[PDB]
Write a protein that binds this ligand. Structure first.
Ligand SMILES: O=C(O)/C=C/C(=O)O
Ligand SMILES: [Mn+2]
Ligand SMILES: [Zn+2]
Length: 351
């Protein structure tokens, strides 16, 4: 029944009305009832009337405490990206460096050309990325799709234990420039994410369907055996870049989508994604959950080589939402198998 929706696992775009846009969890459940999740990634175009902030003009003085210079090494569609932390700077300082002749977007016709330029000049003239900046750009009273307070069951983490994980159950702001990249990865604890592009040049995305996620990992282990030996989940280090031609070459299914200013992207549990920014822009993101996520949460393979890594206790979710399995899970005998095609149960309203 669910195998039949989005059998192509292609990235879908949605244009909700304002009435549909009002309830977050409901619409996430709806797009899953339409098979959106099978692609790993979905675009949601918000109603034109809607706006998160009146104007983006206060922000030139906002501080980026940890700007990152992205150095990329590799060839033949395989790269490892290293981070060099630059001293703090203001948004206005960032934009100046961004729109600079040295770091600005090259000229091009079709998108396919900018894409080609990105994968050709990736390792040259390393850009700076205003990444992982704590904060929101939402006006306090916006009650629709507010990244600051989406009210999903991921809230059970803070509610239960007081714990906040920056960027995961709190918002992050990403100021980008041309040729800034995010490497291949799934979310922490294989959660969902939401990404809103407040302004600027586009953000382009690649995605691999959760049902083919394992194939991508097998490829990644083969191309990076040393890293594979040292960490059970080295892609979570977010340092690994792999070109679409390489994916194509090894028969990994994937899709592309370009995110425009004022557009939302949703990534789904175990959806591998990666991409780059076109020029100076600004993005906001956080993770969130549905009931479907819980099993992914239980089974996520986590980075084994850094103390710093995010690890959410699943205990509370299993007790509240899978009580009949708790004792079994705690005894390590819960062998539930995940079906990536099934939508979250809350969509029983629609399917
Ligand atoms: O904004 C980025 O660079 C990445 C975003 C994401 O992975 O959602
Ligand atoms: Mn992500
Ligand atoms: Zn690791």
């Amino acid at each position: 029944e669910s195998e039949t929706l989005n059998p192509s696992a292609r990235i879908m775009t949605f244009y909700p009305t304002m009435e549909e846009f009002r309830n977050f969890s409901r619409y996430i459940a709806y797009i899953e009832s339409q098979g959106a999740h099978r692609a790993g990634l979905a675009k949601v175009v918000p109603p034109k009337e809607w706006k998160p902030r009146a104007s983006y003009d206060d922000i030139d003085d906002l501080v980026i405490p940890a700007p990152i210079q992205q150095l990329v090494t590799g060839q033949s569609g395989l790269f490892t990206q290293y981070n060099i932390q630059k001293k703090a700077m203001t948004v206005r300082e960032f934009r100046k460096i961004a729109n600079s002749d040295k770091y600005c977007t090259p000229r091009y016709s079709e998108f396919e050309e900018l894409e080609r330029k990105y994968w050709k000049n990736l390792t040259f003239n390393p850009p700076i990325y205003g990444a992982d900046v704590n904060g929101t750009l939402y006006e306090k009273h916006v009650d629709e799709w507010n990244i600051g307070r989406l009210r999903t069951i991921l809230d059970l983490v803070e509610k239960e234990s007081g714990i906040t994980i920056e960027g995961v159950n709190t918002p992050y702001l990403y100021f980008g420039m041309w040729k800034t990249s995010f490497a291949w990865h799934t979310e922490d604890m294989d959660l969902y994410s939401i990404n809103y592009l407040h302004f600027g040049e586009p953000k382009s995305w690649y995605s691999v369907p959760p049902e083919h996620g394992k194939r991508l990992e097998r490829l990644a282990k083969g191309f990076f055996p040393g890293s594979a030996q040292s960490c059970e989940a080295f892609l979570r280090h977010k340092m690994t870049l792999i070109s679409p031609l390489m994916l194509k070459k090894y028969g990994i299914p994937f899709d592309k989508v370009t995110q425009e200013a004022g557009e939302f992207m949703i990534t789904f549990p175990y959806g591998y994604h990666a991409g780059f920014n076109h020029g100076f822009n600004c993005a906001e993101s956080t993770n969130f959950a549905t009931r479907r996520w819980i099993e992914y949460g239980k089974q996520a393979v986590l980075c084994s080589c850094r103390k710093d890594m995010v690890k959410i206790s699943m205990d509370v979710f299993v007790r509240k939402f899978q009580p009949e399995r708790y004792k079994l899970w705690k005894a390590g005998k819960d062998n539930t198998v995940i079906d990536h095609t099934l939508p979250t149960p809350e969509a029983a309203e629609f399917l």
